[PDB]
Structure 1
């Protein structure tokens, strides 16, 4: 998409050399924001082939708050493989917190259910928020989630959402993030009888890995095609009751896929 390519180009034009924790090099910039008017079409990247199938399972899996990579491997989803251990446990890199923010008093807070009510009963609340950033638990932990904060907002019957990522690989994860947020907004809006507004995507450390230069140049050589449209073929009883089969993407004509290197 136009915005997306502009970001790649901006990283190339003005990104700074910065290493990650492995010592592996990137071109990085800090602070970025883009907006996708979801009435204009579902923001699935067209300049490389992406797979809605992967976005759906990933999102249904976050929604369950499953902590084991199993379900993701059944359905051929691998973006989280790096952070999985020996027995496929993802540490804190998952969505348990969304549904079961533990509080020391033997208690658990279901954040998703809370936004759901807020959108129906107080759509103007300035704090319709989900956070996975549980400092108390993340403290002495090797890993940490990266898309750990989102906010909803309602104006004129339309539902909008903003996702903050502290770390974003422009080539690898950003397209997943965008479609995943967009998908949730459609599901949220269906459940709450709202129409869809904007999806706003906000970054901290936004970066391209140095060894993805070839992939990036190829993708920047290609013209974005018209956005597809998401079709939901069932209305489930609750946000947690969706199935892979409910979704279809229409009018998706992408450029060929570009594999990530070794």
Structure 2
């Protein structure tokens, strides 16, 4: 996509070589924002083939409040394998904070049900937020939340969402993260009877890993194709009842996939 290839080029032209946690090394910039009008098409990268199966099942797993990778394995999705322990656990990452944030006094808060109630009863609220950055449980998480905090906004009957992503692997992570949150906005808009507005992505440390440079130059030579259209075939009873089969991505015709190593 235009916005995405502009960011890849910006990291190549402006990024600082930086060491990182994995020992791979990165070219890095800090602070970037891009906006996707979801009315223009579903923002799935076309200059390389993205594995939709992994994107959709990872979002359905988050909405279940699940942090064990068994569900992903049942559905042949292996993207979280390298961080899980012997029992397949990841600790209280995304799904657990979204669905069951533990309070100091022992209660659990379901942020997704809270957001539904706010969108249905107080759409003008400036407080419609979900946060996975639970400071008191960071030490139990396999990987600290990268897409950490997001906010919904309603104006003129359209639902928008902004994500703050503290750390962004531009070649591998970001195509998945954009499609995942664009999908959640479509689901939320359908459940609340709203039209989809904008998805606003904001990044903190936005980086290309040093061993993704050949793949980056290859993808940068490709022309973006027309964005596909997302079709949700059914309106489930709730946001927690969607099924993989309910989604149709129409007209997706990408350039070939480009493999790249994951930095662990």
TM-score range, shorter chain: over 0.9
**Cα 1:261/1:187, change in 2 over 3 Å:** same
Out of 212-221 and 102-111, give the one that drifted further: 102-111
CA distance in 2, matches of 1:146, 1:37: 23
Q: Which residues of structure 1 form unaligned runs of 5+?
A: none
Would the aligned equivalents of 2:47 and 2:254 in 1 still touch at CA under 8 Å? Answer: yes
**In proportion to residue count, which structure has more helix?**
2
- Aligned-pair distance for 1:139? 4.6
List per-residue Cα deviations over 1:5-60 (Å, max 9, x = no partner): 00000010010111111322110111111100000000000000012222110100
**Cα 1:49/1:142, change in 2 over 3 Å:** closer
List per-residue Cα deviations over 1:186-241 (Å, max 9, x = no partner): 00000000000000111111101101111001000000000000000101000000
- Aligned-pair distance for 1:110? 0.6
- Aligned-pair distance for 1:137? 1.4
CA distance in 1, matches of 2:190, 2:5: 30
Q: What SS does the corresponding residue of 2:71 show, helix, strand or coil?
A: helix
CA distance in 2, matches of 1:79, 1:2: 26
Aligned length: 262
Matched with 1:64 is 64
CA distance in 2, matches of 1:90, 1:215: 29
- The TM-score normalised by the length of structure 1 is 0.97
- Aligned-pair distance for 1:74? 2.4
Matched with 1:3 is 3
1:144 aligns with 2:144: yes
**Cα 1:75/1:122, change in 2 over 3 Å:** same
Out of 140-149 and 211-220, give the one that drifted further: 140-149
CA distance in 1, matches of 2:48, 2:239: 30
CA distance in 1, matches of 2:184, 2:169: 21
Matched with 1:250 is 250
Q: What SS does the corresponding residue of 2:94 show, helix, strand or coil?
A: coil
- Aligned-pair distance for 1:142? 6.1
- Aligned-pair distance for 1:71? 1.3
Matched with 1:196 is 196
**Cα 1:142/1:245, change in 2 over 3 Å:** closer
CA distance in 1, matches of 2:200, 2:63: 20
CA distance in 1, matches of 2:61, 2:77: 11
List per-residue Cα deviations over 1:46-104 (Å, max 9, x = no partner): 00001222211010000001010111122232332232122211123331111101113
- Aligned-pair distance for 1:141? 5.5
CA distance in 2, matches of 1:256, 1:116: 38
**Cα 1:146/1:83, change in 2 over 3 Å:** same
Would the aligned equivalents of 1:92 and 1:143 in 2 still touch at CA under 8 Å? Answer: no
Q: Which residues of structure 2 form unaligned runs of 5+?
A: none
- Aligned-pair distance for 1:140? 6.6
CA distance in 1, matches of 2:178, 2:140: 30
